[PDB]
């Protein structure tokens, strides 16, 4: 047992390269047993899974002294090592992996296997990863496998996942970027850089940033084989450079713009239904930067005509909206008449007239210069639109699209008519908009429009009740009788296996409250409302007692359960207790065990990802749990009957954890004073992840209640604390972290002695390297509402914070940030308030 795989770890060196020939399928064999073996591995035989390298290439690489699939067959060994697979083995995982480099005359077999070895080994780290250089070298040269085009955001990742590092400028690939675009093919995966670009955006000049990109453009503009890398093409200086674009405007762009010169015929190379201008969404958002980049008649004139050709100008009459606010008032016209003209007559005139009722609406607030012509002609149009007043959809957009011409009235008809709420709740909204009376002048159009409003008996609706409600001025005429209406289906259908959750049936619960508590005064319906509590009352047990499917419906029912409350307000405040009061235990604990009942039960970037898929994506069942935990989530949200069952829900949530990772995240979704160990969840937790993950980002809004809360009263600190240790002992790996931390430092009073109510020091410390002073933000409260010794040491914190930006290539255009716009910043606080030696810094300046 001891020695037994020891004797096949001797016989591996029996299975090393002379006579391997059997004992390695006898190990592979071994392996394919091997009982805790694993366990050993856990225990001696990580020594044997790194003899699985160790032994492995002494076997292999020495019997390495054609038939690749000698390599196969070991890589299929060494997947048999990894098919260990319970495995981890870092080492290798490093070194066997460097092995499984070429430069480890090879058979590439790592090639989707590292990939395949990168889930949680790239959990666990990089280290440098820099054989993603080696990697890069090994794209960078000859020979074929697309693989690694994309399998370089891996490298990307493994990077831009946990690293914390960048570097070369990137300039590698960047030089082979280029070098690429000469001629090449691969390219989308490759593209793949774009991302390792968008990744290496970090903190840096896009000057630095700026090299290659018409450098590409044009030799890319070429091909367009791939859409797709030119699609991720598309995306980068549309952001960066327009990010470089976004700014000299207040602050080779030309060039750029010459470049986006490619671009403005590059929309004429649109094949495509609306599809090529859908894809060019995207290229609209591009188009946005031809937007500003000055010729959005020229447009109008690309747009003086045509089948296709409306929807290209159509498309792009939005991103012109859209793409920024103000355009040519003068061009209004210009547009306006070519809109009048065009936007009518066609099935595609529609999303024209769409559009146009969207300029339309994108006219609206364009203002500060008034000839009303082109509103008269919109007037006008108003009718000309309210008079084709035929559409499947775009109408119900376009309806208030052309009404925000006000938001004429005849058709508050077409209103009282909706039946015939996308508009409507909307052109409603937009027709209450109007006034609180003003609209209503038919008597009947109210319930007309409750009889429009016979419809959706439109979620979206939400609070539009409210806006259905909106016409009392306490007259109350139709009021009952509205109420009593769908009463009447919510008992005229009356039904525990129908369709219709009763959720948009309990979406009128306190539609009542929507015109009156709006406008007990409320509990005196209660009963009227209570309706729906049976109507709750109803659904609730039933996958609550089965744990089988199609509850999706009912997590989708569910869904509106997150109906929420959250604060100080009038409407959703009304919401409350005919929410809170309203389910007292009605679902209580009805729901709550129904957690307990849940409680014991493209891709390719997740290999370091997996832990983001530990963060995101795993499962669609308990997602419900989520959405009870959402719908759970009320009870803290009610916490300000049946209460308890929160503290009992906590108490049930702190059993313990993998998906409960994902209850990690109910951990934080929270006596307040008991529920310290809440916290303690992480204390293991946070404490498990060694967490390239992004984990405790989360733990700020948990910290936030530790906030909300922080001997009795102690620990959370303490433990926030190690929070902090988290961090501050960490001393490394952010790019993110501290936020919250330093969010943590409301309500100021060895190694966590200085930063408690202090810790400012980091804050101080927050300074230079950062996504460039990340944290530059974290200024803001440092002195916010100080006291007075406390304002001198927030000085000498000022002064120290001064005294901080002493140690800031372009790194001083950095610490021109980041020594100076931060000290710039740095100013910003003192901008606030108070003794200020405001200057008295500018005497640095």
Not at 42 to 52: G, N
Request: net charge neutral; with cysteine.
């Amino acid at each position: 047992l001891v020695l037994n795989d020891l004797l096949i770890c001797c016989r591996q060196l029996e299975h090393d390269r002379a006579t391997e020939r059997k004992k390695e399928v006898e190990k592979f064999k071994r392996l394919i047993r091997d009982p805790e073996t694993i366990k050993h591995l856990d225990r001696d035989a990580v020594f044997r899974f790194l003899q699985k390298y160790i032994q492995k290439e002494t076997e292999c690489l020495r019997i390495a002294k054609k038939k690749m699939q000698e390599i196969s067959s070991l890589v299929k060994y060494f997947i048999k090592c990894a098919n260990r697979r319970a495995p981890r083995l870092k080492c290798q995982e490093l070194l066997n992996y460097i092995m499984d480099t070429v430069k480890d005359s090879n058979i590439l077999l790592k090639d989707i296997l590292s990939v395949r070895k990168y889930w949680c080994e790239i959990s666990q780290q990089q280290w440098l990863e820099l054989f993603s250089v080696y990697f890069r070298l090994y794209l960078k040269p000859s020979q074929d496998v697309h693989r690694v085009l994309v399998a370089r955001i891996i490298h990307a990742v493994t990077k831009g996942c946990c690293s914390q590092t960048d570097g070369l400028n990137s300039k590698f690939l960047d030089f082979f970027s280029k070098a690429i675009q000469c001629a090449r093919q691969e390219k989308s995966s490759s593209g793949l850089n774009h991302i390792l670009a968008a990744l290496t955006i970090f903190l840096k000049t896009l000057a630095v940033n700026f090299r290659i990109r018409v450098c590409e453009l044009g030799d890319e503009i070429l091909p367009t084989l791939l859409y797709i890398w030119t699609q991720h093409r598309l995306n980068d200086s549309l952001k960066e450079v327009i990010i470089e674009l976004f700014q000299l405007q207040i602050y080779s762009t030309k060039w750029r713009s010459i470049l986006y010169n490619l671009y403005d015929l590059l929309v004429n190379e649109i094949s495509h239904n609306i599809a090529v201008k859908e894809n060019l969404i995207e290229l609209m958002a591009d188009i946005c930067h031809q937007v500003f980049n000055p010729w959005l008649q020229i447009a109008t004139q690309l747009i003086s005509k045509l089948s296709p050709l409306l929807m290209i100008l159509s498309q792009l009459l939005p991103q012109q909206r859209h793409g920024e606010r103000t355009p040519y008032v003068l061009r209004c016209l210009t547009e306006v008449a070519l809109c009048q003209d065009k936007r009518s007559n066609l099935e595609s005139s529609q999303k024209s007239d769409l559009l146009k009722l969207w300029n339309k609406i994108w006219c609206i607030t364009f203002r500060g210069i008034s000839s009303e012509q082109i509103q008269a002609e919109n007037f006008g149009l108003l009718g000309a639109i309210i008079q084709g007043s035929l559409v499947e959809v775009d109408r119900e957009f376009w309806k208030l699209f052309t009404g925000s011409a006000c938001r004429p009235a005849v058709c508050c008809l077409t209103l009282a008519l909706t039946t015939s709420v996308k508009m409507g709740i909307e052109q409603n909204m937009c027709e209450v908009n109007r006034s609180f009376s003003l609209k209503e002048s038919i008597m009947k159009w109210l319930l007309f429009y409750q009889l429009e409003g016979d419809l959706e008996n439109f979620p979206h609706l939400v609070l539009e009740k409210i806006l259905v409600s909106l016409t009392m001025k306490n007259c109350k005429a139709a009021m009952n009788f509205f109420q009593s209406v769908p009463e009447c289906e919510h008992h005229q259908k009356d039904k525990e296996e129908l369709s219709f959750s009763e959720v948009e049936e309990l979406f009128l619960q306190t539609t009542f409250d929507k015109m009156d508590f709006l406008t007990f005064s409320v509990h005196q319906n209660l009963k009227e409302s209570l309706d729906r509590c049976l109507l709750g009352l109803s659904e609730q047990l039933l996958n609550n007692y089965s744990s089988e499917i199609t509850n999706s419906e009912t997590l989708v029912r569910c869904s509106r359960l997150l109906v929420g409350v959250l604060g100080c307000y009038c409407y959703m405040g009304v919401i409350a207790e005919e929410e809170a009061y309203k389910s007292e235990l009605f679902q209580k604990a009805k729901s709550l065990m129904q957690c307990a009942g849940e409680s014991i039960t493209a891709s390719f970037i997740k290999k370091p990802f997996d832990r983001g898929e530990v963060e995101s994506m795993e499962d669609d069942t308990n997602g419900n749990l989520m959405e009870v935990e959402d719908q759970s989530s009320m009870n803290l949200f009610n916490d300000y009957s049946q209460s308890t069952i929160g503290a009992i829900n906590p108490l049930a949530e702190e059993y313990l954890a993998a998906d409960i990772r994902r209850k990690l995240l109910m951990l934080i979704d929270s006596h307040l004073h008991m529920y310290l160990m809440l916290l303690k969840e992480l204390p293991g937790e946070e404490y498990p992840l060694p967490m390239e993950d992004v984990l405790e980002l989360l733990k700020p809004l948990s910290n936030v209640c530790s906030l909300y809360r922080r001997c009795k009263t102690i620990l959370n600190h303490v433990l926030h604390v190690v929070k902090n240790l988290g961090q501050s002992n960490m001393d490394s790996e952010n790019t993110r972290d501290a936020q919250g931390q330093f969010l943590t430092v409301i309500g100021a009073f060895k190694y966590i002695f200085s930063v408690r109510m202090a810790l400012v020091n980091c804050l101080k410390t927050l300074l230079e390297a950062d996504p460039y002073s990340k944290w530059a933000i974290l200024n803001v409260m440092g002195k916010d509402f100080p006291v007075n010794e406390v304002f001198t040491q927030f000085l000498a914190d000022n002064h120290h914070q001064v005294r901080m930006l002493a140690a800031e290539s372009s790194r001083l255009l950095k610490a021109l940030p980041l020594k100076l716009q931060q000290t710039a910043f740095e100013n910003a606080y003192l901008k606030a308030q108070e003794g200020m030696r405001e200057m008295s810094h500018s005497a640095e300046n």
